[PDB]
């Protein structure tokens, strides 16, 4: 019948900023948190466990790319398990695929995020250091499963009252099995502009995991000055912003560009001189600035890998390889085969959420 109507018998559908949340009798007392193009996250009260949770309503079935991203986030998160990464505790959707217009994702509730924190507070070095370590600890696990986040930014860094950090919004994430070649196969417009690596623009569809390391450095820079490091208006201005600090690329740097048209654009650019970090960031710990420089390296292949970053001096107090785990089974090439129509993707989403359905009985 109608679960909402059955819920309505006690307490049922609730309205939040023009969006109805049919999260059933179990979840009530929803409060708006944030929203995206096709989704909205709310805090809510789990009446069964008598605790508050976060609920993400997803409405992707109209568009094929939304469906692709929804299935990727659900499949990656359901198999991921890590301290510094958000997980899926429950999934809510209609019993029949015909009625499935929205999909509800229930996650651990986090009080705030790094983006919110930096607007109101300046972080002490020990806070920056600990936050940065946690970011990389989750990132090590992510890259260990052959997964690229592709949207690391302050807003995607959840924070609770006990200085615990988790990474969320894996909708832009994707599998890239290392054995296969992905040059020219990867989605072109990825990451947020200010945290977008140079090679994403310069080598469209030919980037690697190193784009995440670049984002971390931007976040680290943002923590250090409570201000974005590369506030580009558009991709041209963004490229100018990147080269404003790093300076004109080296010839070795120029040789890693495989887009010849792009390389010639760089050659056509006026010479700009590299800016030292200490002048830009006077009060920053040099140990941090040594690592900051190393994750902002123009060359992606020579960019500091996630394991190497953890072992950098600046995190030596928190560095412990025996408690920086990896996934038991990384993701293979078969998991990236989602170049499908949305009607098929909708079926795949429906199958993947079947375990959460009431009385599944495996």
């Amino acid at each position: 019948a109608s679960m909402a109507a059955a819920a309505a018998a006690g307490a049922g559908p609730e309205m939040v900023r023009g969006q109805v949340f049919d999260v059933g009798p179990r979840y009530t007392n929803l409060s708006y948190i944030g929203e995206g193009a096709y989704g909205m996250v709310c805090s809510a009260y789990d009446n069964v466990n008598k605790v508050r949770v976060a609920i993400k309503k997803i409405s992707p079935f109209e568009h094929q790319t939304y469906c692709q991203r929804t299935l990727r986030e659900i499949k990656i998160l359901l198999r991921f398990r890590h301290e510094n990464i958000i997980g899926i505790n429950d999934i809510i959707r209609a019993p029949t695929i015909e009625q499935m217009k929205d999909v509800y994702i229930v996650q651990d509730l986090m009080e705030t995020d790094l983006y919110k924190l930096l607007k109101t507070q300046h972080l002490s070095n020990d806070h920056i250091c600990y936050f940065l370590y946690q970011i990389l600890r989750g990132l090590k696990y992510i890259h260990s499963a052959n997964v690229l986040h592709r949207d690391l930014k302050p807003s995607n860094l959840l924070l609770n009252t006990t200085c615990d950090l988790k990474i969320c919004d894996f909708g832009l994430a994707r599998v890239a099995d290392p054995d296969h070649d992905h040059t020219g196969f990867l989605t072109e417009y990825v990451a947020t502009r200010w945290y977008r690596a140079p090679e994403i623009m310069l080598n469209s569809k030919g980037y690697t995991k190193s784009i995440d390391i670049w984002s971390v450095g931007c976040i680290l820079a943002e923590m250090l000055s409570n201000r974005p490091i590369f506030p580009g208006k558009h991709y041209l201005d963004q490229l100018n912003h990147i080269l404003g600090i790093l300076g004109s690329p080296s010839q070795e740097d120029l040789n890693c560009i495989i887009n010849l048209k792009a390389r010639n654009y760089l050659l056509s650019l006026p010479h700009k001189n590299k800016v030292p970090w200490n002048r830009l960031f006077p009060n920053a710990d040099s140990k941090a600035l040594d690592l900051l420089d190393k994750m902002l390296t123009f060359n992606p292949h020579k960019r500091i890998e996630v394991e190497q970053a953890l072992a950098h001096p600046y995190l030596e107090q928190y560095y412990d390889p025996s408690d920086e785990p990896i996934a038991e089974a990384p993701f293979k090439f078969d998991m990236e085969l989602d170049d499908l129509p949305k009607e098929k993707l909708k079926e795949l989403i429906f199958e993947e959420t079947a375990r959460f359905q009431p009385g599944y009985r495996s």
């Binding site: 600990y130 006990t162 200085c163 615990d164 412990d320």
Partner: peptide
Amino acid sequence: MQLLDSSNLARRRRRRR
């Protein structure tokens, strides 16, 4: 305003050294 000594991960690191 509720900005270490309460985080499980930080505690585990300190215990070792």
